C-alpha cells in the first residue's frame, strides 16, 4: 500500500508564502515510473493542476501557467517527501490542496494511469483574520431528547476559525449513530458546528460519552464530557 | 478548458453518460484521458484510465469511450453509491481537468427528523444563549426553517445552513437562534419549525430546566 501523508490544515495570512509537505511511504520519491504532483480544488474553480516534480536520471519540474511565477515544488530524497510553495497568496488561493502520484506502466505495454494515488488533502484558507480555537458546549440528553428510548446528545463547537474541525466520540470507539453537521458561517465570520450521537437512553447511566474536537489550525483539542440532566 | 455538464440525475438501475468535451489541444490530442470519482470530503479516485481502462477494483458498471473531441463515461446499473462528483482529465504535458459533474441517484421522498436543543447552562454562564435545531434524513434537499418565541414568528438572530449530502444520499441541515441569556429568560417558549414538501414538524423547548 502506497500512502501519502499530508501537512495538516491551517491559515496562511495574505502576501505570505503557502508551504505544504507530502510524505510518501511505500514508494520512492525518485521512482523511475512516477511523478509527484500538486493539485488544488475549490468549490468554484474545480480541480486545478499545479505542477509536477519527477526524477529520470536528472530532477525535473513542470508548472501550470496560472502559477508558474509564484510556485515551487521541492523533492526531498533525504526525508522521502516533496513540498509545495506558493508565493504571495490571496483569498483566491483558499482551496483544498492535494498531492497525487502520476504513475506510468513500464512493463509489457506502457500504461499511463494518471493520478492513481491521492493524499487526503489539506484545507488552506488565506485570510487576514486570525485563527481561533473552538469553545465546546455540551448539548445534554434529556427525556425531552428521547423518542421511544433513543437519546440524542451532542457537542456545540462554537466560534472557531478557520476550518476544519474534526469531531470523534469516545476517542473513535463510538461511531454508530454519529451525525456531525457541516458548519455555519456566523455574521462575525466565525464558524460553528454541531455533532450528535443517537444512543440507547438505557445506556445514559452506564456509558460515558465524550466528544473529541480537534482544531489543528489552532493546535487545540477539546474533549467534552456530555452528561444528562 | 474542458466542458462537463454540471448535474446529471438518474434512477437506480438506469444507465448514465457524462460528456467531456474540449479542444484538439486537450482531449483529442492524445488518448491519455482519465476519469475520477469523488465523494464529499474524500479524495478523488481513478476509475478509468486511457479512455476505457478500468483500474483493478472498479466495477464493470463503469465504461469509458472517446469520439472526436469528446471523451465520455458511462455508468450502468446506477447504484446509490454512484452518487458523487466525476471529472475527466487529459495529459498533454500539462494536465487539464473538466469542470465536474455531480451525479444524483434518485430516491423516494423522506421527511426530516428534527431535534431541538436548549442552551446549555455552561454557555449561559458565559453570557451567551444558542438554540440548536438539527434537521436530518430528508429528501429532496430543500427545507424551510422558521423559529417562534411564545408563539410569535422570529427573524432576528437566525442562521440556517444549506442542506448537505449525508452518506445515505439524504440531506441534513442545521439552524441556530442566537439570543442573550435575558431574552432566553423573557419568554416561556421557543420553537423550531421545519417544513418539507407538505409536512411541517415543530419542536418546542422552555427555559424551565
Residue numbers in the entry:
A (entry chain H): 1 to 229
B (entry chain L): 3 to 211
Paper's wording?
It is the target of the most potent neutralizing antibodies. Here we engineer two bispecific antibodies (bsAbs) using distinct designs and compared them with parental antibodies and their cocktail. X-ray crystallography and cryo-EM reveal distinct binding models for individual cocktail antibodies, and computational simulations suggest higher inter-spike crosslinking potentials by 14-H-06 than 14-crs-06.
Therefore, we obtained the structure of free Fab14, and used cryo-EM to obtained the structure of the Fab14/RBD complex. After superposition of the Fab06 and Fab14/RBD complexes, we found that Fab06 and Fab14 recognize and bind on distinct epitopes on the RBD simultaneously. Therefore, the two cocktail antibodies have distinct binding models on the RBD in the context of the spike trimers.
